[PDB]
From a paper:
To understand the interaction of StmPr1 with inhibitors, we investigated structures of StmPr1 in complex with the well-known protease inhibitor PMSF and the peptide aldehyde inhibitors Leupeptin and Chymostatin, as well as the peptide-like boron-based inhibitor Bortezomib. All inhibitors bind covalently to Ser289, forming a tetrahedral transition state supported by the main chain amid of Ser289 and the sidechain amino group of Asp207. PMSF is further stabilized by a water molecule and Bortezomib is stabilized by the catalytic triad His105. Besides the covalent bond to Ser289, the phenyl part of PMSF is coordinated into the P1 site of the substrate binding cleft. While PMSF shows a IC50 of 125,43 µM needing a concentration of 1 mM to totally eradicate enzymatic activity and Leupeptin even shows a higher IC50 with 130,3 µM, Bortezomib has an IC50 of 1,97 µM, eradicating the activity at 100 µM and Chymostatin has an IC50 of 0,04 µM and needs 10 µM for total inhibition.
Through the COVID-19 pandemic it gained more prominence by being a key pathogen in respiratory co-infections. This study will present a structural analysis of StmPr1, S. maltophilia’s main virulence factor, an excreted serine protease. StmPr1 is a member of the subtilases family defined by Siezen & Leunissen et al.. It shows the main structural and functional elements of the family, such as a reactive triad consisting of Asp42, His105, and Ser28922. The catalytic triad consisting of Asp42, His105, and Ser289 is located on top of β1 (Asp42), α4 (His105), and α10 (Ser289).
Author numbering: 1 to 356
The structure:
């Protein structure tokens, strides 16, 4: 499939480039992810973005700190509206942090997952007939572990005290987020719970050019940990690495690869603070955050394909095995000391193998 989205051809190398893309055109001949729900645990969403409308569920906001959520209270609430995660001043977050504009990360990630495709608008998305369940866990200066852990439980269809039952438990959770520290019990238990419900958990390796083993949830057991490659198909300058990294997706190499080839391009906003300060747009961003959802979306294409052919969905371990075994080996050598998994997720190869 060569969709008619106006910016797809020039911008979305991560979907269709022969060395650095994930082989989406071919995959899309088989599956677009219809009937599957992917929970995006992130900054929230811009639910009326015209290139996302129709592929979103209401979702929920798990941030239990008014100052982080930018909401009026510490309650968790239905919906996942991103209030904006800007930080106005250096050091507000921790010793040495730099002021930044709102990321709209969750809207960008949600785009990679299921941006409306072949709709004559904007960009394309990978599992563009799936639905995104946005689960807002990140706000100003990031998020709280306890919020993220409950979000995992709920997204996967487990019970959380004080939140209504999730009517739409997700086949796949994407966590484009990370922080220092080997995985704990709190994190590990939530993740184990999701796995036990049949949910594949896909996470970003992190962007510290360091060993993923030192970060969470990258270093958690049972997850698909995703490194980042460039348009060249080689490791990005920032990607984390090490034996925990299962495979890579296109994360974008940044400025060395220029514009557009250095960045992953999806739905977002140019708003510097509140949604209202800007307008709907398409943003180029680079990170293991951008790599993860390519992999998460491929998982969704696979589940969808199976369910369509009467087949059973893969269990989490089988999904990870399939994703790793079918990854395209890197077209540029990866240094021995910085392994980033078996290859670059290959949407078509994953599908072919699952449907054998
Ligand atoms: Ca579109």
């Amino acid at each position: 499939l060569a969709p008619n989205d106006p910016y797809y051809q020039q911008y979305q190398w991560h979907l269709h480039n022969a060395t650095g893309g994930i082989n989406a055109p071919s995959a899309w001949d088989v599956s677009q992810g219809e009937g599957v729900v992917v929970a995006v645990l992130d900054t929230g969403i811009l639910p009326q973005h015209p290139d996302l409308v129709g592929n979103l569920l209401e979702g929920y906001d798990f941030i239990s700190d008014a100052s982080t959520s930018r909401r009026a209270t510490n309650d968790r609430v239905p919906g996942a509206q991103d209030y904006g995660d800007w930080v106005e001043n250096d050091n507000e977050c921790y010793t040495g942090s730099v002021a930044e504009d709102s990321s709209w990360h969750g809207t960008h990630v949600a785009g990679t997952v299921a941006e409306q495709t072949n709709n004559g608008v904007g960009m394309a998305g990978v599992a563009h007939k799936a639905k995104v369940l946005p689960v807002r866990v990140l706000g100003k200066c990031g998020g709280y572990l306890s919020d993220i852990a409950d979000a995992i439980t709920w997204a996967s269809g487990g019970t959380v005290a004080g939140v209504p039952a999730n009517a739409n438990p997700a086949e796949v959770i994407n966590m484009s987020l990370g922080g220092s520290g080997s995985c704990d019990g709190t994190y590990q238990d939530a993740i184990n719970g999701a796995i036990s419900r049949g949910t594949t958990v896909v996470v970003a390796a992190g962007n510290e050019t360091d060993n993923a083993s030192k970060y969470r949830p990258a270093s958690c057991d049972g997850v698909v940990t995703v490194g980042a490659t460039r348009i060249t198909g080689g490791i990005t300058y920032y990607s984390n690495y090490g034996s925990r990294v299962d495979l890579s997706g296109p994360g974008g190499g940044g400025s060395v690869d220029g514009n557009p080839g250095g960045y992953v391009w999806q739905s977002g906003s140019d708003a510097a603070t509140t949604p209202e300060s800007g307008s709907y747009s398409y943003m180029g961003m680079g990170g293991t955050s951008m790599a993860s959802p390519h992999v998460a979306a491929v998982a969704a294409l696979v589940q969808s394909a199976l369910i369509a052919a009467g087949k059973d969905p893969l269990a989490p371990a089988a999904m990870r095995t399939l994703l790793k075994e079918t990854a395209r080996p890197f077209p540029v050598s990866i240094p021995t000391a910085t392994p980033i998994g078996t290859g670059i997720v290959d949407a078509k190869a994953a599908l072919a193998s699952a449907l054998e």
